[PDB]
Design a protein around this ligand. Structure first.
Ligand code: A1B2Y
Ligand code: ZN
Length: 139
């Protein structure tokens, strides 16, 4: 679990979105595993606007943050779940690091701000859904 709070918006993994998130829906993209809902309070998280490939993510299954090198956002094949059939997920970045399904939503940050949230991982892997291209989050 985990979410980004910026302005009048809440960014969550689409597969973890609640009934409240869907009744206050602003935008969703199944191919990215992202959903954005509107909120009654103002958020102060800062979204990074950069091409950083290094940062730190929160891993809830270890109660720890880990520094990682991560790939550029791209279409990567992801295996099936009760949430999705096997498919290409877009705007996804991989790093070598620990992750388990309940780790989805943990934030990845660089010196410029929030980069994305955990959404994948594998055998050692871990994947992050990028949010840096969502320029409208700031306005
Ligand atoms: C086996 S480690 C791991 C870590 C994070 C996530 C997963 C698998 N997964 C993929 C998600 C997606 N983005 O399609 C949907 C929900 C889900 O459980 C495995
Ligand atoms: Zn950066």
């Amino acid at each position: 679990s985990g979410a980004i709070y910026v302005g009048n918006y809440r960014v969550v993994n689409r597969h973890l979105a609640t009934h409240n998130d869907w009744a206050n829906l602003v935008w969703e993209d199944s191919s990215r595993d992202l959903l954005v809902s509107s909120t009654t309070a103002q958020g102060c998280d800062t979204i990074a606007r950069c091409d950083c490939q290094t940062g730190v993510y929160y891993c809830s299954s270890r109660r720890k943050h880990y520094p990682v090198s991560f790939s550029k956002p791209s279409l990567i094949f992801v295996e099936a779940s009760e949430y999705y059939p096997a498919r290409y997920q877009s705007h996804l970045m991989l790093a070598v690091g620990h992750s388990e399904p309940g780790d989805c939503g943990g934030i990845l940050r660089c010196q410029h701000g929030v980069v994305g949230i955990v959404s994948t991982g594998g055998n050692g892997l871990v994947g992050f859904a990028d949010v840096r291209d969502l320029l409208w989050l700031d306005e």
